[PDB]
């Protein structure tokens, strides 16, 4: 069985804060951007697929109802078919 991971679909990518120019806000910067990272929906684990392909076991069709009685069967018509049917009429 083949196994495939699927990258998250239409998940909201984490948007990060621009880099500060002053040192005193570098801590706050790391904290803010830390929260975006810790909640990244694009990051693994990804959902997976399991491609099943059970093609049965070639069972045989069990008793399907037929689409088609003992009537009288006499070959009277043979006597009125002219020449080449008198041979069958003899039989």
């Amino acid at each position: 069985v083949t196994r495939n991971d699927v990258a998250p679909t239409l998940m909201s990518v984490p948007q990060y804060r621009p880099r500060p120019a002053n040192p005193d806000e570098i801590g706050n910067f790391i904290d803010e951007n830390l929260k975006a990272a810790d909640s990244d929906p694009t990051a693994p684990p990804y959902d997976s697929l399991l491609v099943f392909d059970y093609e049965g076991s070639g069972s045989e069709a069990a008793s399907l109802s037929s689409l088609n009685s003992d009537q009288d069967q006499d070959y009277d018509y043979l006597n009125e078919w002219g020449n080449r049917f008198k041979k069958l009429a003899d039989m």
Partner: protein, 534 residues
């Protein structure tokens, strides 16, 4: 049958000594006679005594066959189509028909819009597909399929049962035969059968055809697009077990393409219901079809968790035990339900409330079943998202088992598995450890296991995903001075500096954070981060 027994030897011998004549006329080409010849032969084929005589002579059978695929007179093409039907009731008759090339002739008769002709033609091909060997590849050559699929619109359930089965026999074990059926609108025609008819045999034979088709990569889409998922889902509740199982086989097969399907609420609802059914194969197909349908589908995820699906899955893992046929799909389904949907935080909690931690964690100790281990690790990570699971997980000794998987997978990696790459295991463990390291007590265990040297090495990894979870677990690990000292001494001070340039701002952030914590009670790092144009 009592009268036919009395004059049986007479009838048999009488017909035998009349074959040359009947074969003579039937061959004598002028329809008025031929039609009258196939008429009496048709009457003789109605009796056993004379039927067996007729099938016994290759000459008569060949004569009838030829006459069939020529005549245009309905009477004649109905009179010769009925004898073959009759003769097909006998293995010796099937073989004679087969050798006379009756198959092509009979395929040709699948054009006529007439009941009789069509009925005789199909029941005879069916008999050839059920018994006479070599028939299958013979019908495929006579383009049978092409003329059988347009027959799926006839409004006769008995007739349809036979036709569908014919397709089944021809489709089974033949990749090419499956593709032809697709080109001729097979899926849609078959799926309509499932929506319209109540006849159980036709539904069953049809579900078997759908089953054989669902394995084809190109057929899958066609069936789902035509409403296969929903049409088969309606029949999961039938009173015929053989039908329910054939539908489940098919739904599971199609489930990897229905991850974006519409209005599958009723189906999922009963798939979760089937996770309790005692029938193992049912339990296994339902658990499988669920793992697929909840793949990247927040809607399905929410509906499944909204129908006691998490509880249902845990009870399935407990009944299954060492069965990776149930456990794997069920652990994948749980990992799905615990991430990326409005009710994920809910499923993360229900797994704990329903005592899934014990059962699930233990699944990390499976021998040659990596796929289940990889899946379980991912599930654990999601569960670690919920703060209330940090303890339950440490109770099941997940941190130890994880680091054990980690070290091992890192040796085999630094060196150079059912499709499972060891690289992904390092990421999995480090990734679950990154989340579990949110809890303070879990940080101690991780640090006592001397895992810092390892994590610091992973920072050198080429795999982005590895570097991120690595710099992450170090990040949350450096939150304490004792662990930070170790991280500084291990020489991690440098690699983090070079990760600040990571195009993945995620790991970049983690890198910066670590550097900022390893210089707590120990500025040059701050300049590196601010004083950079690019």
């Amino acid at each position: 049958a009592i009268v036919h027994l009395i004059n049986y030897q007479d009838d048999a011998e009488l017909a035998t000594r009349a074959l040359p004549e009947l074969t003579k006329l039937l061959n004598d080409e002028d329809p008025v006679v031929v039609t009258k010849a196939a008429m009496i032969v048709n009457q003789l084929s109605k009796k056993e005594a004379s039927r067996r005589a007729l099938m016994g002579s290759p000459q008569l059978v060949a004569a009838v066959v030829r006459t069939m695929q020529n005549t245009s007179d309905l009477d004649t093409a109905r009179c010769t189509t009925s004898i073959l039907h009759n003769l097909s009731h006998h293995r010796e008759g099937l073989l004679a028909i087969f050798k006379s090339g009756g198959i092509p002739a009979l395929v040709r008769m699948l054009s006529s819009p007439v009941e009789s002709v069509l009925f005789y033609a199909i029941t005879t091909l069916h008999n050839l597909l059920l018994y006479q060997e070599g028939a299958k590849m013979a019908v495929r050559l006579a383009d049978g399929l092409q003329k059988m699929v347009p027959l799926l619109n006839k409004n006769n359930p008995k007739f349809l049962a036979i036709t569908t089965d014919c397709l089944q026999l021809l489709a089974y074990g033949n990749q090419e035969s499956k593709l032809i059926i697709l080109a001729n609108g097979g899926p849609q025609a078959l799926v309509q059968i499932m929506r319209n008819y109540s006849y159980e045999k036709l539904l069953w034979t049809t579900s078997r055809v759908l089953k054989v088709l669902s394995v084809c990569p190109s057929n899958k889409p066609a069936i789902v697009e035509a409403g296969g998922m929903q049409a088969l889902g309606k029949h999961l509740t039938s009173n015929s077990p053989r039908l329910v199982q054939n539908c489940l086989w098919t739904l599971r097969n199609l489930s990897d393409v229905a991850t974006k399907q519409e209005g599958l609420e009723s189906v999922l609802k009963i798939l979760v219901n089937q996770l309790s059914v005692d029938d193992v194969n049912v339990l296994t197909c339902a658990t499988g079809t669920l793992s697929n349908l909840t793949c990247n589908n927040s809607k399905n995820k929410t509906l499944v968790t909204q129908n006691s699906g998490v509880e249902a899955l845990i009870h399935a893992i407990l009944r299954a035990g060492d069965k990776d046929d149930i456990t794997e799909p069920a652990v994948c389904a749980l990992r799905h339900l615990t991430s990326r949907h409005p009710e994920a935080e809910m499923a993360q909690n229900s797994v704990r409330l329903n005592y899934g931690i014990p059962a699930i964690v233990k699944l990390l100790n499976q021998p040659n079943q990596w796929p289940l281990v990889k899946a379980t690790i991912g599930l654990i990570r999601n569960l670690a998202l919920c703060p209330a699971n940090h303890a339950p997980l440490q109770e099941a000794a997940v941190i130890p088992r994880l680091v054990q998987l980690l070290v091992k997978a890192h040796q085999d990696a630094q060196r150079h598995t059912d499709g499972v790459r060891m690289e992904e295991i390092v990421e999995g463990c480090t990734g679950a450890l990154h989340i579990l390291a949110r809890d303070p007590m879990n940080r101690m265990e991780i640090f006592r296991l001397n895992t810092i040297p390892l994590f610091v090495q992973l920072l050198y990894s080429s795999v982005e995903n590895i570097q991120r979870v690595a710099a992450g677990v170090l990040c949350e690990l450096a939150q304490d001075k004792e662990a930070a000292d170790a991280i500084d001494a291990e020489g991690a001070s440098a690699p983090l500096m070079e990760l600040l340039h990571s195009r993945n701002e995620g790991t970049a952030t983690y890198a910066a954070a670590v550097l900022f914590r390893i210089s707590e009670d120990k500025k040059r790092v701050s300049v590196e981060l601010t004083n950079s144009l690019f």
